[PDB]
Every structure is written in C-alpha cells, then in structure tokens.
C-alpha cells in the first residue's frame, strides 16, 4: 500500500486490500494514503505523492547561530 502500481495493472493498490491500511504511527501520513518518515516532511523533496509533504512549511534552512 505505497500508492504505486507495482503489480502490473495496479492490482496491489486496490481498495479491497488497502482500504483499512495504516502505517507505523511515528511516520508522517499523507493526503493520498502514502507514508514517509516524519523527518522527510518539508525537505524540498516531494517524497509523498503530489506535494502535501512539503506544502505549508517555511523553508528556514540555515544555521542561525
């Protein structure tokens, strides 16, 4: 249930298998039903599909000290 059509014609991601799926609770949860570790969120990479992992964060990225 990674939201990818691995099994040829999309047969692995069908609703009757994935419908009640959840992922390890420490990981981030994404709008399209895909999970990436929480640190992946907002690192300029759209690791989750579309852009909901990056969307909304302020990209403060330098050593303020």
């Amino acid at each position: 249930c990674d939201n990818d059509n691995d099994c040829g014609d999309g047969s692995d991601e069908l609703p009757t298998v994935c419908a009640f799926h959840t992922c390890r609770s420490t990981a981030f949860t994404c709008a399209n039903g895909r999970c990436v570790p929480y640190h992946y969120r907002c690192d300029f990479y759209n690791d989750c599909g579309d852009n909901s992992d990056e969307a909304g964060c302020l990209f403060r990225s330098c050593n303020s000290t």
Binding site: D6, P37, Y40, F44, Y45, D47, S61, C62
Partner: protein
C-alpha cells in the same frame, strides 16, 4: 626519536619532537571511513552492494537509499536552487561554487572567500579582498 612531550603538544601543528612524530597525520586526523569500491554507503553507517540502492526496497535504516534514484535535481530548479554549479547522483545531488568562493551550510548558497584574512601568507606586502 626518544623524547617526551606534554600531551597537549602531541597535535598542535608544531614539530615539538624533532623527528616529527608529533603532528603525524595518522595521529592528528582520521580519514572519512568508506567501504569496498564495488559497494555503496547510505547516510547511516551502513554499506550495501550498489545495485541494491535503487532496487525499490529500503536498505538503509533511514530508508534514504531509494529516495534519490528517480530525480535529476539539477534539472529541477526547485530542489537544486544552487548558486553556481550542480551535479546529479544516483542518490541526491551535489552543489559547488566557482573557484574563489565557498559554500554554506544550506549546501546551496555561495559566498566570497576573504583570501587575505583566511590565508595572509598569500601576498608578501599587502592583500586586498575582491
């Protein structure tokens, strides 16, 4: 050479021991560790056969092996907002500044080296930064 020096002297860029045992590179510095050249290293201290890095299966404890394989970051200005030059890699990418410039912790910004302050021995009389 048969000499005793205080422990603070052992690595301070001074040949206190005349044989130059003091200041030996193997003593004062550690090379970045690697693994067989036929292999690959993820962010964590792990080394895997290189073919595995893009096999769609997470190998590293941090799952960072598979993350980079699909993106040519230099062609994607959003991720690669580099100041001078960018180069792709099967995992992630690297960014580099032109000669005379240095890179900053965001690993994308470039800044101008004050060569006079950083290396005053460059000019025998006076130095001016540009």
């Amino acid at each position: 050479n048969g000499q005793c020096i205080t422990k603070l002297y052992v690595c301070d860029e001074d040949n206190d021991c005349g044989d130059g045992s003091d200041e030996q590179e193997h003593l004062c510095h550690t090379p970045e560790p690697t693994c067989p050249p036929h292999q690959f290293r993820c962010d964590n201290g792990h080394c895997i056969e290189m073919g595995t890095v893009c096999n769609h299966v997470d190998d590293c404890s941090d799952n960072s092996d598979e993350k980079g394989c699909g993106i040519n970051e230099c062609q994607d200005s959003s991720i690669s907002h580099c100041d001078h030059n960018c180069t792709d890699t099967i995992t992630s990418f690297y960014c580099s500044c032109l000669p005379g410039y240095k890179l900053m912790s965001d690993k994308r910004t470039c800044v101008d080296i004050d060569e006079c302050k950083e290396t005053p021995q460059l000019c025998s009389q006076k130095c001016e930064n540009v």
